[model samples]
Target: SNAMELDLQPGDVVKVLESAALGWVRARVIRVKSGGRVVVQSDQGREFTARGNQVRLIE
Candidate 1:
């Protein structure tokens, strides 16, 4: 069974999944808020906030 809803874990490279082109934009983990909410940054250095299943961790 799957758990955590947490492909968006902090400090890992992740892609915008839900709203942003279904993985179009990739970013680095910037910070994490409560309940799967994550703050991410692109290589260009802009912060993106994705919550829950909004982003997936890069393998």
Candidate 2:
């Protein structure tokens, strides 16, 4: 399934398709909860907690 359409959970991995500060980031989902929020920590010291519609899977 596409990450954007997924109801993500903690420890999930995702690939970022678009961003201004970062491009094509792959990170582990640290948190997912109500309000369509998803938190992910990347290898580049970036913690992203974006809406479920903002990201997609690598494959």
Candidate 3:
């Protein structure tokens, strides 16, 4: 899923583009998955997986 384009690392902050429930929810990078997916933890302590393209670095 073109994940190699993202230069993310653990601890980086990202914004969820399709999070309707939170509306631009922010999360921290937990790890990169094997299949071009990323594991992230929300500010509220919720963890979820998303594609690298689904998230954008906050800064």
Clashes of each: 0, 0, 0
- Candidate 2: the clashing residue pairs are none
Write the residue-wise lDDT of candidate 1 on 1-59 in tens digits.
Answer: 12337555467776665343445577777777765557877777777677645565543
Query: How close to the true structure is residue 53 of candidate 2, measured as C-alpha lDDT?
Result: 64
The best candidate in terms of lDDT = 3
Scored by TM-score, the top model is 3
Give candidate 2 regions above 4 Å deviation: none
Each model's lDDT: 0.63, 0.69, 0.72
lDDT at position 6, candidate 3 = 72
Question: Which sections of candidate 1 miss by over 4 Å?
Answer: 1-4, 17-23, 34-36
lDDT of 1: 0.63
Candidate 2 residues 1-59, lDDT tens each?
76457666787777764377766678778777566567877767677776656666656
Candidate 1: residue 48 Cα off by (Å): 1.6
How do these models rank on TM-score, best leading? 3, 2, 1
- Candidate 3: tens digits of C-alpha lDDT, residues 1-59: 23425776778877865476657778888888887567888878887886666777643
lDDT of 3 at 51: 65
> Total backbone clashes of model 2?
0
